[PDB]
């Protein structure tokens, strides 16, 4: 019964990544941005699942979710939403291999994070 719930959980997150709109303020989008920023991960299985987001991949520049971006930990903090344009990166289309984002998916890192601190 738990294997069914885990797969349904992964299915919701996958469609959430597909339907993510950078301009809309939504609590479900906020919760996912929080997980990616705090657990330090991108996507569910991998960050390439964000390539199924039509709005993201239609950008002319290297654009990625801001919550996925590799960043240091602040003092007493911390989650940026929406889409971020890569620093320095010609208008040659969106390139996922160029995203300065965490390379591990949140599926694997959340379980490791849970088995480590609780």
């Amino acid at each position: 019964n738990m294997g069914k719930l885990k797969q349904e959980m992964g299915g919701i997150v996958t469609e959430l990544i597909r339907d993510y709109q950078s301009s809309r303020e939504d609590s479900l989008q906020d919760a996912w941005d929080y997980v990616q920023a705090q657990v330090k991960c991108c996507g569910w299985v991998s960050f390439y699942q964000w390539t199924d987001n039509a709005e993201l991949m239609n950008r002319p520049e290297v654009t990625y979710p801001c919550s996925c971006e590799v960043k240091g930990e602040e003092d007493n903090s911390s989650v940026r939403k929406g889409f971020c344009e890569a620093p320095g990166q010609t208008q040659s289309g969106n390139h996922p291999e160029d995203w300065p984002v965490y390379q591990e998916g949140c599926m694997e890192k959340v379980q490791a994070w849970l088995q480590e601190n609780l």
Copy 2:
């Protein structure tokens, strides 16, 4: 309802079944994730803590027993103190499990998680 609302309801459906199938002895990452939410956001159940009464194992206990992650507790210094499993209320009368006796957070996680997200982003 919008496409995000229907993902929100499906997410709430998983949590409801997760609470029903919750086993105090099993080590599971999905159970761990829910215990973390209840302890950190300080809430119990999805809509309300009465959803835990759908857990047959919990309601079959002879004493006042509640999820440990729901328990009212102070915040530790630099520590994510999250207790798993079922907790028995602080020798007592063996008159069955009474949810009205649970020293747990009275707010459901559905309402409280959005408030936590809408405040500190």
